[PDB]
Amino acid sequence: MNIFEMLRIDEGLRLKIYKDTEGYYTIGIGHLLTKSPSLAAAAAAAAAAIGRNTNGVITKDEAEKLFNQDVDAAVRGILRNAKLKPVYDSLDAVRRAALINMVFQMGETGVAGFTNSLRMLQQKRWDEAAVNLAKSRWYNQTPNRAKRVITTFRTGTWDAYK
Ligand SMILES: [Cl-]
Ligand SMILES: [Cl-]
């Protein structure tokens, strides 16, 4: 299993604009287009992202391309962030995927706000960090996905995705 496979299970693939779990316009593999309510502002963002008039639908190829860019951006955001980098540096390969996953979904700023849990991951106190991440809006809003990420951090294995 790897970060790409992990995120492809968590996000799914939609080739037509859709709405995320919170209502935002998304397309592809979890690619947020815009937070605005306007389908049109979203169609515009989509065209800008794809380089073509898209009339709201993209190919699998275009979706994968956006996905590749977003994972790369997820990783570079983490390495550039003063709060995240040291957490990342400290983790094994599996748990690193888990943190990239969180950054992909909530952005660097958001993950950066899990100060107490980050501190416990850094200390390798898995069970406590898992308990702490569970009292978050994140956990309460997308519980199944969050349980998967949380178990990956607790255990260090891909079990939850198998
Ligand atoms: Cl983009
Ligand atoms: Cl969920």
Question: What are the phi and psi torsion angles at 122 (to 5°)?
Answer: -55, -30
- In this structure, are residues 146 and 98 in contact, taking their beta carbons and an 8 Å threshold? no
- This entry's atomic model was obtained through X-ray
Which ligand is nearest to the Cα of residue 150, counting in written order? 2
Single out the catalytic residue among 5, 10, 20, 72: 20
Domain boundaries, the chain: 1-162
Separation between Cα atoms, residue 75 and residue 98, nearest integer Å: 11
- The upper half-sphere exposure of residue 150, i.e. CA atoms within 13 Å in the direction of its Cβ, equals 20
Active site residue 72: no
Task: Single out the residue of 153, 69, 59, 155 nearest to residue 111, CA to CA.
Answer: 153
State whether CATH 3.20.20.140 applies to domain 1-162.
no
Active site residue 20: yes
